[PDB]
Amino acid sequence: MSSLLVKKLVESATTPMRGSEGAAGYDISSVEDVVVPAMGRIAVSTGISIRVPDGTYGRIAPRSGLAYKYGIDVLAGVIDEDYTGEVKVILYNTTERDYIIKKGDRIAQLILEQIVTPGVAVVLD
Amino acid sequence: MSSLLVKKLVESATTPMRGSEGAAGYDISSVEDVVVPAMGRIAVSTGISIRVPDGTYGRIAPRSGLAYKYGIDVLAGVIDEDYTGEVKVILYNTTERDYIIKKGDRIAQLILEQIVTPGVAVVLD
Amino acid sequence: MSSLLVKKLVESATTPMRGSEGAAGYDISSVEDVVVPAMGRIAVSTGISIRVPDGTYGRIAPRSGLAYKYGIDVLAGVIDEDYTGEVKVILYNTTERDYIIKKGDRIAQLILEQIVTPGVAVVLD
Ligand SMILES: O=c1ccn([C@H]2C[C@H](O)[C@@H](COP(=O)(O)OP(=O)(O)O)O2)c(=O)[nH]1
Ligand SMILES: O=c1ccn([C@H]2C[C@H](O)[C@@H](COP(=O)(O)OP(=O)(O)O)O2)c(=O)[nH]1
Ligand SMILES: O=c1ccn([C@H]2C[C@H](O)[C@@H](COP(=O)(O)OP(=O)(O)O)O2)c(=O)[nH]1
Ligand SMILES: [Mg+2]
């Protein structure tokens, strides 16, 4: 069906899941203990691969929590409906102090955003 | 109805409003005079609480103006349809020079983005 | 029709185009050789002007490539359906080392994201 098809590639991996009735995203957790460097970025591995529903891509959005408290932001984050590989979550540390991530930690959130994918019309001949 | 239900929690607060026919967002103003630190972040208070329409969350997006001119970016920014609290706008100063915000200043913009919230289908048994 | 109407304003300009069947965005290329400064931002010119389809705005999203490899992020990025001017792509260099951009380089990607633009309902009288 056209829901969020998820495929774990490591048992450690968690199934994305929304935290509330009105929640906009499905939590995305870390599958490795990593350190996102001060003023630096890192590529955390989710351990899963997903197929967003049709006519809608998946945007890795930042979590209110880590943003406010640790100045953690999310770089890139555009997952195409044709992406068969593993979801990588690229975080950027806005702080002068390192951030610690442990297997299991919800490090971001997926949001199936509806988009229109029409053809291009070039004007000016 | 399913429009943008807004609830001011301080008279100082401004009603979000789109700046043009084709505008994608409703302006979100500051309700306090604050300073967003160089290479730092701050949590500006909007003074309002909103309920995005159904099947669509609210994304606090950055303003072309402040982005270009002061290197002001917007962290976090995901407001769930079930959020009953006050909207906080988390800004991050990309500059080596402080930025000044005064009650009333449009500091960001809300965008009711349509999303699909289906269930999760786990493959691999 | 309601597709992506594109208008080149310099022959150098490239027509936005999706890189795959499931791709979520249309590549947006640079039309000038520019340098986005370490820990700095710049406004790259696309040389084109577009009209996103109706009931959907255009979001300049970052490319997985440049994000991971050079720590390149995209500031602002909200293009309203009523924008008649030229698309400017504002990039922010997260790195301590400069980044080089050359006419033609795909520097970002446009994503026609569906949004709802209803009226505002103010509660509390
Ligand atoms: O934060 C991100 C952003 C993207 N992707 C995946 C989803 C998408 O399907 C693929 C895109 O890589 P690319 O588009 O082929 O390279 P580029 O963006 O330079 O065109 O990378 C991630 O795993 N994490
Ligand atoms: O910039 C933001 C981002 C989110 N929120 C609100 C909207 C949402 O309903 C709530 C989410 O907090 P949380 O999701 O419960 O904490 P976490 O993101 O770590 O799960 O915070 C804001 O006010 N400002
Ligand atoms: O990265 C961006 C972001 C926006 N715009 C364009 C699209 C939009 O139509 C216009 C908006 O400028 P503005 O909204 O009138 O100034 P402000 O955001 O302070 O209201 O700028 C760009 O070209 N590049
Ligand atoms: Mg940033």
Author numbering:
A (entry chain A), B (entry chain A), C (entry chain A): 1 to 125
Q: Which statements did the authors publish about this structure?
A:
dUTPase (EC 3.6.1.23) is a ubiquitous enzyme that catalyzes the hydrolysis of dUTP to diphosphate and dUMP, the substrate for thymidylate synthetase in dTTP biosynthesis. The 141-amino-acid deoxyuridine triphosphatase (dUTPase) from the algal Chlorella virus IL-3A and its Glu81Ser/Thr84Arg-mutant derivative Mu-22 were crystallized using the hanging-drop vapor-diffusion method at 298 K with polyethylene glycol as the precipitant. We previously generated Mu-22 dUTPase by mutating two IL-3A residues to the corresponding residues from PBCV-1 dUTPase. The presence of these two mutations (Glu81Ser and Thr84Arg), creating the derivative Mu-22 dUTPase, led to an increase in the optimal temperature of the enzyme to 328 K. Here, we conduct structural studies of dUTPases from Chlorella viruses in order to elucidate the molecular mechanisms behind the differences in optimal temperature.
Glycyl-seryl-tagged dUTPases yielded cubic P213 IL-3A crystals with unit-cell parameter a = 105.68 Å and hexagonal P63 Mu-22 crystals with unit-cell parameters a = 132.07, c = 53.45 Å, γ = 120°.
